[PDB]
Amino acid sequence: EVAAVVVVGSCMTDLVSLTSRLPKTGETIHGHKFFIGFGGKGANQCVQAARLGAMTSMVCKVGKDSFGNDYIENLKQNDISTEFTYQTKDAATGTASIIVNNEGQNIIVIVAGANLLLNTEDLRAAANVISRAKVMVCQLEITPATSLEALTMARRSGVKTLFNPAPAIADLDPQFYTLSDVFCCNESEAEILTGLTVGSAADAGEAALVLLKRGCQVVIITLGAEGCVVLSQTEPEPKHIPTEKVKAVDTTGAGDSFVGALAFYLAYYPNLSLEDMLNRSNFIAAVSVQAAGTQSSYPYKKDLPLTLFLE
Amino acid sequence: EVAAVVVVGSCMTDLVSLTSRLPKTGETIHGHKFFIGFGGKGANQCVQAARLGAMTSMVCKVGKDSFGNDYIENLKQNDISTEFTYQTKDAATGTASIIVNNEGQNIIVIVAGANLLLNTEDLRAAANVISRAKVMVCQLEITPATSLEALTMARRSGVKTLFNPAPAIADLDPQFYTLSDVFCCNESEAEILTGLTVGSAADAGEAALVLLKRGCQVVIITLGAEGCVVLSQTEPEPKHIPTEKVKAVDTTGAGDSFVGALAFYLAYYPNLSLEDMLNRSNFIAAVSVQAAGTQSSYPYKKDLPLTLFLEHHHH
Numbered sequence: 002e003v004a005a006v007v008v009v010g011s012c013m014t015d016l017v018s019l020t021s022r023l024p025k026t027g028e029t030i031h032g033h034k035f036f037i038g039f040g041g042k043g044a045n046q047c048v049q050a051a052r053l054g055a056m057t058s059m060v061c062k063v064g065k066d067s068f069g070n071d072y073i074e075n076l077k078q079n080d081i082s083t084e085f086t087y088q089t090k091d092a093a094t095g096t097a098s099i100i101v102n103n104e105g106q107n108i109i110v111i112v113a114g115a116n117l118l119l120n121t122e123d124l125r126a127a128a129n130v131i132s133r134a135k136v137m138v139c140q141l142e143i144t145p146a147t148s149l150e151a152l153t154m155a156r157r158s159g160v161k162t163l164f165n166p167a168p169a170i171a172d173l174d175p176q177f178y179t180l181s182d183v184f185c186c187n188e189s190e191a192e193i194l195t196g197l198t199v200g201s202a203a204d205a206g207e208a209a210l211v212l213l214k215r216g217c218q219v220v221i222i223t224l225g226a227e228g229c230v231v232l233s234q235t236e237p238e239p240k241h242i243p244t245e246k247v248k249a250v251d252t253t254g255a256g257d258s259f260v261g262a263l264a265f266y267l268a269y270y271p272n273l274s275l276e277d278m279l280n281r282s283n284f285i286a287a288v289s290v291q292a293a294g295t296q297s298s299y300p301y302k303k304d305l306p307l308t309l310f311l312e
Numbered sequence: 313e314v315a316a317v318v319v320v321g322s323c324m325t326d327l328v329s330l331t332s333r334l335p336k337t338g339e340t341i342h343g344h345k346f347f348i349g350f351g352g353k354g355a356n357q358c359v360q361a362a363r364l365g366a367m368t369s370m371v372c373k374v375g376k377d378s379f380g381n382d383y384i385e386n387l388k389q390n391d392i393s394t395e396f397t398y399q400t401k402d403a404a405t406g407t408a409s410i411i412v413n414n415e416g417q418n419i420i421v422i423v424a425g426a427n428l429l430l431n432t433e434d435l436r437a438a439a440n441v442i443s444r445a446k447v448m449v450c451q452l453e454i455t456p457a458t459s460l461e462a463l464t465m466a467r468r469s470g471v472k473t474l475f476n477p478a479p480a481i482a483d484l485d486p487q488f489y490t491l492s493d494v495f496c497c498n499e500s501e502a503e504i505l506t507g508l509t510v511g512s513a514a515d516a517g518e519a520a521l522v523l524l525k526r527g528c529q530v531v532i533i534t535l536g537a538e539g540c541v542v543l544s545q546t547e548p549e550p551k552h553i554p555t556e557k558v559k560a561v562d563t564t565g566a567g568d569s570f571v572g573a574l575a576f577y578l579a580y581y582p583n584l585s586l587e588d589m590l591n592r593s594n595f596i597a598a599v600s601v602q603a604a605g606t607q608s609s610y611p612y613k614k615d616l617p618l619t620l621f622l623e624h625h626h627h
């Protein structure tokens with residue numbers, strides 16, 4: 002039952018209130034709807050890869066609380082290995098409290114909580130599962146020392162590293178670049194990392210070259226409805242890969258859908274060209290934007306065209 | 313065993329994030345702590361009355377969900393009867409999403425949820441607990457038609473009605489006034505209901521008289537550190553009842569403490585004058601503002617002065 006995709010990253014409870022307008026300082030307002038969902042970039046990416054057919058393992062930490070218990074059940078209901086899903090009494094399960102108005106404007110408060118207490122001792126326990134994987138995926142929602150050690154362990158075992166610098170910090174440790182076989186971010190993260198404005202595929206190609214020279218082997222910048230741009234040490238000329246023109250219902254977590262799809266193709270279809278993998282990943286992310294509710298929008302293999310699983 | 317105070321009203325899960333500052337519009341920030349607390353004006357008033365030694369019953373509706381199950385455990389931990397706490401598959405437990413900065417400034421979004429599905433069938437099933445009570449307390453955090461039905465059932469049963477029009481609506485149904493034995497609101501609610509300024513005891517006397525003439529038997533406007541102002545159909549000249557001068561730590565939920573204390577005295581010390589009941593209720597609410605965290609700040613009888621529980625008028 003070997004995991005081909007290991008995700009070392011975050012699980013977060015999403016707490017969403019829908020309002021007619023955002024509250025002002027000192028203001029109590031009444032919203033019209035509240036819901037809970039399962040989020041966190043690590044878990045979102047793992048759930049998309051699992052639903053495409055990947056054997057996955059989620060290395061993460063949640064609270065010894067109701068939210069933590071519910072999160073472990075969510076991973077098992079998506080056929081994800083929870084062998085190295087830890088729980089702790091020392092902090093609450095990570096939370097994202099989101100207030101959203103009718104026009105889709107928001108205010109968000111994140112408390113990473115238990116996610117931050119995933120430590121190098123917890124990783125070292127997963128050494129054998131990491132060593133037998135094809136792809137290791139990380140983000141920036143846990144403690145950086147933990148993510149850096151995960152990428153180091155992957156490299157030592159010859160496991161391909163897929164790094165998503167999300168959310169982005171302007172002074173990212175240079176080892177994040179040099180430990181990344183595939184570096185994938187969105188337009189706003191590329192602007193934070195490079196200081197360049199990114200308002201077109203051409204601008205994304207300029208930002209991607211900066212990231213390449215910092216030591217990345219492959220750089221992908223996602224561009225929402227414009228698909229993505231890719232370049233590599235072997236092919237440094239930026240290629241624009243356009244996506245399905247669709248009617249977006251809810252673009253929340255499309256980035257995570259795209260990253261989880263890419264992990265699945267890197268693990269299970271290593272013979273496909275990068276261009277082909279990014280075309281399929283674009284298509285899967287595009288399906289996700291045509292439904293509401295983050296993980297509940299992620300498509301399963303049985304509902305996707307057969308051609309996404311050929312060649 | 314019989315509940316003398318029946319609260320027909322709201323339970324809300326408080327989902328609290330602590331941050332160094334409140335976010336800007338479109339802004340994502342990191343906070344340093346998230347925790348769950350128990351709120352809702354109905355439950356808050358019930359908890360204060362129960363901690364003063366009242367046998368209470370909370371008529372309410374929560375989700376058939378973990379937040380609802382946890383709310384029922386909270387009520388039981390405060391020795392409240394949950395025999396008429398309903399659940400529903402058709403709505404989540406009410407929620408208050410609260411962001412609090414380091415100076416204690418906040419943003420709150422309330423989604424009433426299951427509280428709005430408390431219905432006429434649910435109240436009819438609670439008819440015996442209502443008819444056996446001394447005082448029925450309600451607010452405006454459930455469907456207002458539901459609060460109006462509870463007040464109607466109380467009045468028909470000769471049960472004293474204590475109505476807190478919170479949060480306030482500018483045009484309440486006229487029966488909210490005529491069915492209220494004791495109508496209790498704060499300065500901001502009085503301003504909404506009357507169209508007047510309510511800043512001082514003098515302003516509160518004018519606003520309280522407009523409310524009394526809509527058909528309330530007793531009107532009480534709370535004035536924070538200035539205590540409260542009362543008048544009644546019997547004694548329409550407003551009286552100003554001042555409160556304990558105290559060093560406030562956290563005034564959140566002081567209104568609910570005051571209303572819960574008042575319910576307690578109406579139920580267990582009916583002999584006392586309104587002025588004596590308000591003096592004691594003010595004192596209890598002032599203890600609550602000396603500690604953080606709404607329900608967790610509400611004092612127990614064992615920690616209060618014995619003089620609050622004398623049957624007779626005290627010096």
Ligand SMILES: Nc1ncnc2c1ncn2[C@@H]1O[C@H](COP(=O)(O)CP(=O)(O)O)[C@@H](O)[C@H]1O
Nearest residue numbers: 187223224225226228244249255256283286287
């Ligand atoms: N409006 C839209 N129409 C079609 N595809 C979309 C789309 N928004 C996003 N996608 C797809 O989802 C991928 C990732 O989306 P983003 O670049 O928006 C990352 P994020 O905004 O979720 O962080 C894109 O590369 C694209 O394939």
Ligand SMILES: Nc1ncnc2c1ncn2[C@@H]1O[C@H](COP(=O)(O)CP(=O)(O)O)[C@@H](O)[C@H]1O
Nearest residue numbers: 498534535536537539555560566567594597598
């Ligand atoms: N700073 C303070 N010092 C003493 N008592 C206070 C107080 N703030 C509130 N109280 C007590 O709590 C009662 C209800 O308080 P409020 O009138 O503040 C209700 P709110 O406007 O904050 O909802 C007051 O009548 C008084 O007895």
Ligand SMILES: [Mg+2]
Nearest residue numbers: 225252255256
């Ligand atoms: Mg997007």
Ligand SMILES: [Mg+2]
Nearest residue numbers: 536563566567
């Ligand atoms: Mg106050």
Ligand code: NA
Nearest residue numbers: 251289292298
């Ligand atoms: Na979606």
Ligand code: NA
Nearest residue numbers: 562600603609
């Ligand atoms: Na308090």
